[PDB]
Coordinates of N, CA, C and O in Angstrom, one line a residue:
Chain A
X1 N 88.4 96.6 96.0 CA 87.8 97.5 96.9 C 86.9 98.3 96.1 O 86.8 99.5 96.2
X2 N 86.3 97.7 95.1 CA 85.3 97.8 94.5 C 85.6 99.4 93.2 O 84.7 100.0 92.5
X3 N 87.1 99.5 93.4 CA 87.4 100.7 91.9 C 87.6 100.2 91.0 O 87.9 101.0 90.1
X4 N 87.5 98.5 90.3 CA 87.6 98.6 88.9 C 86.2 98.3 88.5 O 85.9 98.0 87.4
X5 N 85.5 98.4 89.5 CA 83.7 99.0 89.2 C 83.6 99.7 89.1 O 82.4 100.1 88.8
X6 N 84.5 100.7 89.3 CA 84.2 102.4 89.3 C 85.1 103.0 87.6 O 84.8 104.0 86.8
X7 N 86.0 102.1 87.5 CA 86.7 102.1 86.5 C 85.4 101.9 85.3 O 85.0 102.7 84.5
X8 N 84.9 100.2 85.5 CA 84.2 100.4 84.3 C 83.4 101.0 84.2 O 83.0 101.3 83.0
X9 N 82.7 101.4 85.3 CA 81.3 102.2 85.2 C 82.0 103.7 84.2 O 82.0 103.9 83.0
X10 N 82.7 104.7 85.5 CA 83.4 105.9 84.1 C 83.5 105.7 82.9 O 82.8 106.4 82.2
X11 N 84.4 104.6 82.1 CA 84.7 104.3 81.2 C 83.4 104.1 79.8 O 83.2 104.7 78.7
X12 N 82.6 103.0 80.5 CA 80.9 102.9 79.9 C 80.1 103.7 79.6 O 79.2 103.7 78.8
X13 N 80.7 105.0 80.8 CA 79.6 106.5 80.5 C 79.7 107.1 79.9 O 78.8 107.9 79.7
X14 N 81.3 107.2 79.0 CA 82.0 107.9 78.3 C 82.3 107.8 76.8 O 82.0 108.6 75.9
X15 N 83.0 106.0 76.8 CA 82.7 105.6 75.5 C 82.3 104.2 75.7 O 83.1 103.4 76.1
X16 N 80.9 104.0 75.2 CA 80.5 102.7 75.7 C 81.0 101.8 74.7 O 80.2 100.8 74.8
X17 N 81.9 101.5 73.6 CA 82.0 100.5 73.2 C 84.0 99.7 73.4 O 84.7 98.9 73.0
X18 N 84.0 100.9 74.4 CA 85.5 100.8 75.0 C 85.6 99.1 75.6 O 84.7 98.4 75.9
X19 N 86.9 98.6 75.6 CA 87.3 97.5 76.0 C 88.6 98.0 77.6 O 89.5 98.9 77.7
X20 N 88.3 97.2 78.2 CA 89.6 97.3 79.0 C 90.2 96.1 79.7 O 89.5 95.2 80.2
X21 N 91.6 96.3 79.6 CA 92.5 94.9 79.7 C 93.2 95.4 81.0 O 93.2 96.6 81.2
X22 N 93.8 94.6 81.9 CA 94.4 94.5 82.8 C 95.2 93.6 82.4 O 94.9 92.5 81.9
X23 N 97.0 94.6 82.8 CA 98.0 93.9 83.3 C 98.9 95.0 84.4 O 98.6 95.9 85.2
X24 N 100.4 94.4 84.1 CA 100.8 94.3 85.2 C 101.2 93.5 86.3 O 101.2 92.2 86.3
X25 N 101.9 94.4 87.8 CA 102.5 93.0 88.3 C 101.9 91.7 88.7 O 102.4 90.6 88.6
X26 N 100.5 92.2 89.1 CA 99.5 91.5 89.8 C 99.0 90.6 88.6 O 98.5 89.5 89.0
X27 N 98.9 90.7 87.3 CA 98.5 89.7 86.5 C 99.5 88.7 85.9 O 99.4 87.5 85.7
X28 N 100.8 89.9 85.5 CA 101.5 89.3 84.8 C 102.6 88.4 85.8 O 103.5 87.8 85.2
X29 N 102.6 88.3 87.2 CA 103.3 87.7 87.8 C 104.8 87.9 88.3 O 105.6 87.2 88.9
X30 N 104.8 89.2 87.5 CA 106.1 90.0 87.6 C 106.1 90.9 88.8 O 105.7 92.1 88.7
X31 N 106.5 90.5 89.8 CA 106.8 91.6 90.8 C 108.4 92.4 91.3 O 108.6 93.2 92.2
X32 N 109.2 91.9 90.2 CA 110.6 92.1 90.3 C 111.7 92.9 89.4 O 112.9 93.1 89.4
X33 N 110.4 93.2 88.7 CA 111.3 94.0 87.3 C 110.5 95.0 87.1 O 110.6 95.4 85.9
X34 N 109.5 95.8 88.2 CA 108.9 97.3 88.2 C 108.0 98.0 87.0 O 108.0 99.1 86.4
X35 N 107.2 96.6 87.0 CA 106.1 97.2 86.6 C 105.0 97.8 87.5 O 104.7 97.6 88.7
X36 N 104.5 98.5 86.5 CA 103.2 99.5 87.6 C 102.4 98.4 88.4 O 102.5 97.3 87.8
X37 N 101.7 98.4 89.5 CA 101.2 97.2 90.6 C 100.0 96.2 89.6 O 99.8 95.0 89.7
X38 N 99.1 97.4 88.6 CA 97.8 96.8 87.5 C 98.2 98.5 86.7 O 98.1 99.7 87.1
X39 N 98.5 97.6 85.6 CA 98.0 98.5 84.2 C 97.1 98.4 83.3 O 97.1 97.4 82.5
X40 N 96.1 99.5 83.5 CA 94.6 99.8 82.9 C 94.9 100.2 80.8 O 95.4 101.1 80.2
X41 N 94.2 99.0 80.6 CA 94.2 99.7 79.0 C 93.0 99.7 78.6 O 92.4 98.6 78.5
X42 N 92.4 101.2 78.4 CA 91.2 101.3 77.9 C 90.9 101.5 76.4 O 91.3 102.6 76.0
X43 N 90.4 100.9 75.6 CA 90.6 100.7 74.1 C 89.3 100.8 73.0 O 88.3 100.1 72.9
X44 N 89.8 102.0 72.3 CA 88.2 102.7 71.6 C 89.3 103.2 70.1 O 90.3 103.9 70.0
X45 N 88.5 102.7 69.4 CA 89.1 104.0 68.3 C 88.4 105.2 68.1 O 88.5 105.9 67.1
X46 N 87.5 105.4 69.3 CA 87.0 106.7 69.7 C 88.1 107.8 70.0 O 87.9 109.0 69.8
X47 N 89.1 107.4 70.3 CA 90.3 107.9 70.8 C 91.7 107.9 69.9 O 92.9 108.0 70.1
X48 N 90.6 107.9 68.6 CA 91.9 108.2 67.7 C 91.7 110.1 67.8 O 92.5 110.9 67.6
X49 N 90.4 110.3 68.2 CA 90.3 112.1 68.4 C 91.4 112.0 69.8 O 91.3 111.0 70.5
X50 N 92.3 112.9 70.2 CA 93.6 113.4 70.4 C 92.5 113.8 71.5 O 92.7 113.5 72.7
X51 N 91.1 114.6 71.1 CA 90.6 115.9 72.3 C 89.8 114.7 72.7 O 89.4 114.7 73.9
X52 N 89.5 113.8 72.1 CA 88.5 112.6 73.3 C 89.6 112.2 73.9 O 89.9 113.2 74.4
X53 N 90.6 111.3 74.3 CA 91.9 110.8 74.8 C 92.1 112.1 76.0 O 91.8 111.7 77.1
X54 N 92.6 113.8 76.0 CA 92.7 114.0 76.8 C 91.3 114.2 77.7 O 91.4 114.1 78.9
X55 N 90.6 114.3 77.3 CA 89.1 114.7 77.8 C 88.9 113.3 78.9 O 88.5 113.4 80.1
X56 N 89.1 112.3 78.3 CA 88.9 110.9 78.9 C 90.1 110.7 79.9 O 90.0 110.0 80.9
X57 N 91.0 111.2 79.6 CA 92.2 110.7 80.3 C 92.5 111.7 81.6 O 93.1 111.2 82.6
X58 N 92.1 112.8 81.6 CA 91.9 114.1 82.7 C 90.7 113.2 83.3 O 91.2 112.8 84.4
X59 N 89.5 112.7 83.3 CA 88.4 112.8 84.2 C 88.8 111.4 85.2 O 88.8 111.5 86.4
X60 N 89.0 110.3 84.5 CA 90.0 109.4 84.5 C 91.3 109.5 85.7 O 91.0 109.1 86.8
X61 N 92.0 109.7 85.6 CA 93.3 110.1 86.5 C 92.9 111.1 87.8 O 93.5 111.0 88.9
X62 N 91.9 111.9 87.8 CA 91.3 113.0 88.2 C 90.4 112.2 89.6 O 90.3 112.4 90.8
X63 N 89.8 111.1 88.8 CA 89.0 110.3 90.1 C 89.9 109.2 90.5 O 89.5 108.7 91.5
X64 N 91.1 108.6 90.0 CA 91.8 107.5 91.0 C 93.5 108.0 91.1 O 94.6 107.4 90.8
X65 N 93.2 109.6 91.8 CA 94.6 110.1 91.6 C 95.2 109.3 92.7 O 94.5 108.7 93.5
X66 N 96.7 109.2 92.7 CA 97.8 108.4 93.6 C 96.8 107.3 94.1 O 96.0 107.3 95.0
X67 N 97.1 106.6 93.1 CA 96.4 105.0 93.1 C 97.5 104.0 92.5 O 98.5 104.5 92.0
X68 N 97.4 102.6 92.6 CA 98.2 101.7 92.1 C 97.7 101.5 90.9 O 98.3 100.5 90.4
X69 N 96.8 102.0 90.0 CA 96.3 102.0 88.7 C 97.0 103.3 87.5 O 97.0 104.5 87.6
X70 N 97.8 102.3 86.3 CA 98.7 103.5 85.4 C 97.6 103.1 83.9 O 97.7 102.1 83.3
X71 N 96.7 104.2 83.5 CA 95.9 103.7 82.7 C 96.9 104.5 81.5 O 97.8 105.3 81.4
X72 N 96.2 103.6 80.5 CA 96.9 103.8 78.9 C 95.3 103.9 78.2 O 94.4 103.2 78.4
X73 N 95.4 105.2 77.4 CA 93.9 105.2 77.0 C 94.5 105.5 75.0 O 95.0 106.4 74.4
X74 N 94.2 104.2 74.7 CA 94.8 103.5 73.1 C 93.6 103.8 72.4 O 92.5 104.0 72.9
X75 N 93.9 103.7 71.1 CA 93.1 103.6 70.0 C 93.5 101.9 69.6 O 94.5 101.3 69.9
X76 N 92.6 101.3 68.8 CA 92.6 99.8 68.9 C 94.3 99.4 68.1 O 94.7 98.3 68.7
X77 N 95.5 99.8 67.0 CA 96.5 100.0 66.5 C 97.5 100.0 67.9 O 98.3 99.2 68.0
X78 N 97.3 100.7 68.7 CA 97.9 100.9 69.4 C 98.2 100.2 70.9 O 99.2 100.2 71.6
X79 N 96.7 99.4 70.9 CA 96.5 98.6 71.9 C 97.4 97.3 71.4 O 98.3 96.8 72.1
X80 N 97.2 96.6 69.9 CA 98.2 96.0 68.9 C 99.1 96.1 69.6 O 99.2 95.6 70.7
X81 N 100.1 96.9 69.0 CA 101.7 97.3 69.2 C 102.0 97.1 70.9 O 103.0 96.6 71.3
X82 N 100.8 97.7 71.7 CA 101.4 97.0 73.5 C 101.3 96.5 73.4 O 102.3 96.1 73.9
X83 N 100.3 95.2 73.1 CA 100.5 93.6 73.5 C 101.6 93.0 72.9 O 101.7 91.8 73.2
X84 N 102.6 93.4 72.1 CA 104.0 92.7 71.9 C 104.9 92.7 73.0 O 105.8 91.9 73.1
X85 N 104.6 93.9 73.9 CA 105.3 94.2 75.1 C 104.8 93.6 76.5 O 105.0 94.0 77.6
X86 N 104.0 92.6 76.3 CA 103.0 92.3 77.5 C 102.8 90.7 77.6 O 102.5 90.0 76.7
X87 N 103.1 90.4 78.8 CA 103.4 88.7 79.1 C 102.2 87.9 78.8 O 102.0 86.9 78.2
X88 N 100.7 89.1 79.6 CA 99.8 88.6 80.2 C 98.9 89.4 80.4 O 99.3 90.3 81.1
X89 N 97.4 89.6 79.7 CA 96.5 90.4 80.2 C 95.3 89.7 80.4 O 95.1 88.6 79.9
X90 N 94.3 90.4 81.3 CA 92.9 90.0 81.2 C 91.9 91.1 80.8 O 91.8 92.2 81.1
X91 N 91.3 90.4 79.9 CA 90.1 91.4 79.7 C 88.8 91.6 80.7 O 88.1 90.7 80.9
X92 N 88.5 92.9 81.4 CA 88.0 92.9 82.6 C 86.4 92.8 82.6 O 85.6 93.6 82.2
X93 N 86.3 91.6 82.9 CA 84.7 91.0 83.0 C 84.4 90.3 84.3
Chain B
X1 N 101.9 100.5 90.9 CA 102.6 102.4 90.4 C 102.9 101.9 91.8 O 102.2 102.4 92.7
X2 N 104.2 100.7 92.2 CA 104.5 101.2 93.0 C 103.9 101.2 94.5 O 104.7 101.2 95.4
X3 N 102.6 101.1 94.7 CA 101.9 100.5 95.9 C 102.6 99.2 96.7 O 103.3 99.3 97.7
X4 N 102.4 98.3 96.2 CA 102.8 97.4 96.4 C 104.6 97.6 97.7 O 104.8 97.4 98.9
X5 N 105.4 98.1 96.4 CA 106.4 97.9 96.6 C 106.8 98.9 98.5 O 107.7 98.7 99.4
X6 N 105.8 100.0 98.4 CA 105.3 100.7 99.7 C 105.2 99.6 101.1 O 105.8 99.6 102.1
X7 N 103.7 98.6 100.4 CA 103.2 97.7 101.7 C 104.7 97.0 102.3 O 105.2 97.1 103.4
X8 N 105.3 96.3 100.9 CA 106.2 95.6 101.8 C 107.0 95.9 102.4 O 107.5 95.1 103.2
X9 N 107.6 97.3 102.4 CA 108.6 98.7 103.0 C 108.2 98.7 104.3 O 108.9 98.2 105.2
X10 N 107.0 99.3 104.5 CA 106.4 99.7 105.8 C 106.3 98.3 106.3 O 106.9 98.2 107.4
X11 N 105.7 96.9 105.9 CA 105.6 96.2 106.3 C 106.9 95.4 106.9 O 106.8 95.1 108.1
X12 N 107.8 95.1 106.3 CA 109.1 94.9 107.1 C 110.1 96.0 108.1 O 111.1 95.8 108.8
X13 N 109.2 96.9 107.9 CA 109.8 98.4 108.9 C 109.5 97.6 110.5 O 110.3 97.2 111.3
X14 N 107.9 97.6 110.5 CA 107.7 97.0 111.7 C 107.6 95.7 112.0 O 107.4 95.5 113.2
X15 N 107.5 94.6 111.1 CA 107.4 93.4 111.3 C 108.2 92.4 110.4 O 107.8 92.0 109.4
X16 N 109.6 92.1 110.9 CA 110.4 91.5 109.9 C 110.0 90.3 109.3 O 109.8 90.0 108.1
X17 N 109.8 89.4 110.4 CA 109.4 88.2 110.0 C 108.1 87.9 109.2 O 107.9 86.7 109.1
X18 N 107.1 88.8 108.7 CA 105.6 89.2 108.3 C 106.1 88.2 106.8 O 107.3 88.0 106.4
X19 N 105.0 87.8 106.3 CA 104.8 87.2 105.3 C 103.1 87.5 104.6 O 102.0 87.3 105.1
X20 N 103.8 88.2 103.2 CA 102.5 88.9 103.0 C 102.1 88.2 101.6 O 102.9 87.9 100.7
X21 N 100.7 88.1 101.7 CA 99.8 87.2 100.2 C 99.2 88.3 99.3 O 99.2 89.5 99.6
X22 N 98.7 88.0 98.4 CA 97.7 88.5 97.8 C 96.8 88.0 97.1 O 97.1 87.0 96.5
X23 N 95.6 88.5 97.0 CA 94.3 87.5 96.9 C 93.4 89.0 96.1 O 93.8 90.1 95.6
X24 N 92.0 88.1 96.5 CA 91.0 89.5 95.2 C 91.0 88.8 93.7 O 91.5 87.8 93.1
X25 N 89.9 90.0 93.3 CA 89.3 90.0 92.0 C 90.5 89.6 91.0 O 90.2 88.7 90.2
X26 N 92.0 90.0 90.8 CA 92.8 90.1 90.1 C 93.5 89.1 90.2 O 94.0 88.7 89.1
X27 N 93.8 88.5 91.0 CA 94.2 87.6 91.4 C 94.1 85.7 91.1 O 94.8 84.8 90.6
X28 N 92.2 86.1 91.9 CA 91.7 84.9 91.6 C 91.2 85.2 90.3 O 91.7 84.4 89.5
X29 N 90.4 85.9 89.7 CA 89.3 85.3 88.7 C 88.2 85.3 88.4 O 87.8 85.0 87.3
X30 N 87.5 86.0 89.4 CA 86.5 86.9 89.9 C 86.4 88.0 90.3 O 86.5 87.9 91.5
X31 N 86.3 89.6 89.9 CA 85.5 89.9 88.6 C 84.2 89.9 89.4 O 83.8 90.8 90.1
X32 N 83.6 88.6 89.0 CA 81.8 88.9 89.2 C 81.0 88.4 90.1 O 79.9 87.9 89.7
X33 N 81.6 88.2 91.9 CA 81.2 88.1 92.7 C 81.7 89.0 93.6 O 81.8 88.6 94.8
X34 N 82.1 90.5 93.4 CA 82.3 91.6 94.5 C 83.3 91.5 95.2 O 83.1 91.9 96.3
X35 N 85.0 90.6 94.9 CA 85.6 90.4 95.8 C 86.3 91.5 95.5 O 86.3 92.0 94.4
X36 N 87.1 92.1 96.9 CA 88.0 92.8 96.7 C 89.2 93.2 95.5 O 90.1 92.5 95.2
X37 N 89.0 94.2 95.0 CA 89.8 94.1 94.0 C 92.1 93.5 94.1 O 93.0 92.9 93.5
X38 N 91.7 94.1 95.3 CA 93.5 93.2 96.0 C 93.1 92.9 97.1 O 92.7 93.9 97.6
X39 N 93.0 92.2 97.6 CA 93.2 91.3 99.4 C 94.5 91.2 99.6 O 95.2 90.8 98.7
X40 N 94.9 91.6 100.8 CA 96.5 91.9 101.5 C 96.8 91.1 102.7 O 97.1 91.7 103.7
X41 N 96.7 89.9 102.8 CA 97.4 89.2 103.6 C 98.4 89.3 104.5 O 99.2 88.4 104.4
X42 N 98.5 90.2 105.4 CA 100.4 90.3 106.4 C 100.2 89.4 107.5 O 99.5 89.8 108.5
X43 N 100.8 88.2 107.5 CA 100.7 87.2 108.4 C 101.9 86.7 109.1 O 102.9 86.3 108.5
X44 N 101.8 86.8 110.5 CA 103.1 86.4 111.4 C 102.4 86.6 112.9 O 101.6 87.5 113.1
X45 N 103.0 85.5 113.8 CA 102.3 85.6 114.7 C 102.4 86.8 115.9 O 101.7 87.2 116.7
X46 N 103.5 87.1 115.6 CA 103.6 89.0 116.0 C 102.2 89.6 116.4 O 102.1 90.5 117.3
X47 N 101.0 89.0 115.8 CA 99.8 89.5 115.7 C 98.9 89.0 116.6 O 97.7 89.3 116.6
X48 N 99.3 88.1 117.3 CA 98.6 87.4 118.4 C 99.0 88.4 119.6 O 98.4 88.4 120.6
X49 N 100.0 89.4 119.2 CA 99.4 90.6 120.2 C 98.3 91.5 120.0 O 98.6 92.4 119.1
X50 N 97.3 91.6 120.4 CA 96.3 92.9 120.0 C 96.4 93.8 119.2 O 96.0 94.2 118.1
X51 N 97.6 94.4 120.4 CA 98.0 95.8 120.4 C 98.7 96.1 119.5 O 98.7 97.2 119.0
X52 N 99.5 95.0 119.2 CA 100.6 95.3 117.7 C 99.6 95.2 116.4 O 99.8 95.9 115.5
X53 N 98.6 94.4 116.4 CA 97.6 94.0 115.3 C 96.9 95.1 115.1 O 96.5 95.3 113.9
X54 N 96.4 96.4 116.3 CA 96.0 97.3 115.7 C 96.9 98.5 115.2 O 96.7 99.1 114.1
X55 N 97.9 98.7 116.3 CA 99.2 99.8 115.6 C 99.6 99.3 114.1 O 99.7 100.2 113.3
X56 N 99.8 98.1 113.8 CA 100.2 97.9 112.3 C 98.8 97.9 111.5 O 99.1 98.1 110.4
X57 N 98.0 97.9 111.7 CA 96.8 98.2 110.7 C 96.6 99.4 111.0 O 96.5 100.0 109.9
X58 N 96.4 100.3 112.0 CA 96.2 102.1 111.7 C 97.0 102.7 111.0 O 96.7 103.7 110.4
X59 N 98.3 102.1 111.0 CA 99.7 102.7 110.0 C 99.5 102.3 108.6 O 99.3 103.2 107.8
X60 N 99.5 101.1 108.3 CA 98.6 100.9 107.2 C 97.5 101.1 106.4 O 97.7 101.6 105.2
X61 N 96.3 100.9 106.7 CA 95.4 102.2 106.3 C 95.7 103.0 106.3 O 95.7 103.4 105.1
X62 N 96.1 104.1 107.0 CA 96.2 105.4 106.8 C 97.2 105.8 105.7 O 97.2 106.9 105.2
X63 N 98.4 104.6 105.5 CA 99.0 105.2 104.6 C 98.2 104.7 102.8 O 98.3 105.0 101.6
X64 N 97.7 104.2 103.3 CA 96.5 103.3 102.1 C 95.1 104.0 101.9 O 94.2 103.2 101.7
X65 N 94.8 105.1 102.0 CA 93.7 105.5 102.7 C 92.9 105.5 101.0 O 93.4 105.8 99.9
X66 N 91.6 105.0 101.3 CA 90.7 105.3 99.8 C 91.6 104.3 98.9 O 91.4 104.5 97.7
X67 N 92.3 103.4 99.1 CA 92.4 102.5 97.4 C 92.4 101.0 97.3 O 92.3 100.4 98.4
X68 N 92.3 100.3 96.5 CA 92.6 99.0 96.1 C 92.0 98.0 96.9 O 91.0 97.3 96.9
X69 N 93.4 98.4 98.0 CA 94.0 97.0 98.6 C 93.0 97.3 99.8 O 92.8 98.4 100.4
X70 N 92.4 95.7 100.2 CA 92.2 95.4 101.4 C 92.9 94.5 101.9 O 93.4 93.4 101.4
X71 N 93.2 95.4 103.5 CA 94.5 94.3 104.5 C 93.8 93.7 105.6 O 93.0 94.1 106.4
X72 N 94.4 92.6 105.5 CA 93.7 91.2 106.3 C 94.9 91.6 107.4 O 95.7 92.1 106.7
X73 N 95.4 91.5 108.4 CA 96.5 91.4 109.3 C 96.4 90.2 110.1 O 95.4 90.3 110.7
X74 N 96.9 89.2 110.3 CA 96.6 87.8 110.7 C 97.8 87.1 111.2 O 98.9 87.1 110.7
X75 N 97.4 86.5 112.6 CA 98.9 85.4 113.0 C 98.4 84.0 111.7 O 97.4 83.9 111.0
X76 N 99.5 83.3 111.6 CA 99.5 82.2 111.2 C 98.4 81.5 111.5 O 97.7 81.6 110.5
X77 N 97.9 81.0 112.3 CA 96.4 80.5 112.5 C 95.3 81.2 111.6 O 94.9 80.6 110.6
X78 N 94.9 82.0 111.8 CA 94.0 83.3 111.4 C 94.2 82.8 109.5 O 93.2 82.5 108.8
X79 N 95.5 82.9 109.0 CA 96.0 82.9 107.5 C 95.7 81.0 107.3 O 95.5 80.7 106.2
X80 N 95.6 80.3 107.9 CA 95.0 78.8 107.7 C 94.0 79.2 107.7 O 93.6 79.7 106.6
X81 N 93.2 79.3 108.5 CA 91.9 79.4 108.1 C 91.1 80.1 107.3 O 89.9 79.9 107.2
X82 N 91.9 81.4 106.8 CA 91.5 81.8 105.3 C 91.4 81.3 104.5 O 90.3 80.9 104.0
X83 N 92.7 81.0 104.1 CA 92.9 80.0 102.8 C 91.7 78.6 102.7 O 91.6 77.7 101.8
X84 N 91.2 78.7 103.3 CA 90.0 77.4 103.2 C 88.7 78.2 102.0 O 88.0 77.6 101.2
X85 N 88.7 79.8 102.3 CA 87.4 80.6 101.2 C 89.0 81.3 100.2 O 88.7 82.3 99.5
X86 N 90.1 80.8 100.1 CA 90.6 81.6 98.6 C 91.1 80.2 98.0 O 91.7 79.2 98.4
X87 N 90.4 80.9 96.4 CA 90.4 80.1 95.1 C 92.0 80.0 95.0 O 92.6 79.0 94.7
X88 N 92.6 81.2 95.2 CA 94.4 81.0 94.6 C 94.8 82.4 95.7 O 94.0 83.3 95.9
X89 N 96.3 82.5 96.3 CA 96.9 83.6 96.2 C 98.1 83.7 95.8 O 98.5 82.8 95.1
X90 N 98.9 84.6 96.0 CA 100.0 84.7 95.5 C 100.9 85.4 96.7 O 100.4 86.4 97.3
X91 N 102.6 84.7 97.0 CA 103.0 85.1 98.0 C 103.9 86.2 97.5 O 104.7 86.0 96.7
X92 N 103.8 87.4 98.0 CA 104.5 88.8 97.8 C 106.4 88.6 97.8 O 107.0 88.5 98.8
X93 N 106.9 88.6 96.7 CA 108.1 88.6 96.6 C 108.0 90.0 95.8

């Protein structure tokens, strides 16, 4: 319904060399063990600054409040360490 | 976050026998032809009444208002001849 165009568009205005992966139930096929419906990982080592991460993560949450979207806003280390925990993602192209 | 687990709630509240799909951008694979980011399939022929086809979709949207998912509401007939324009769906367990 046309919000993970809205997703990348924010995202691109913000920090344009961000990456974002989608998982979750809907990708990873897991509908039974409560994962969030799609989890947003937006991925910059722009966001090793602490004050870009909340800055990004307030504007972010602010436009897709009580939505089926739980974004994670990583520094690239960090994006690492979640994909050990993760079945299945897509990179959103 | 949970959405999901909502549709099929309300969706068995009023229609037990309902059998619900999911389709869209996430789904199939595309991404970069404008499809709905989730397509919501609730199919049973319950829906070959009008009147129930629009009471279960005003309850629906409204409680869906502004996100994601687009709901298809469909008897069984209606859900065959979808499936002729989707690449893949997946059936909601």
């Amino acid at each position: 319904a046309g919000h993970m165009k809205e997703i990348k568009e924010i995202t691109k205005k913000d920090v344009q060399d961000a990456e974002i992966y989608l998982y979750g139930s809907v990708v990873e096929g897991d509908y039974s063990i409560g994962l969030s419906d799609i989890d947003v990982a937006i991925v910059s080592d722009v966001f090793e600054d602490r004050n870009r991460k909340l800055e990004f993560f307030g504007k972010i949450t602010k436009k897709f409040f009580d939505s089926p979207f739980e974004f994670h806003i990583l520094t690239k280390k960090e994006w690492k360490m979640s994909k050990r925990f993760i079945r299945k993602y897509r990179r959103l192209d």
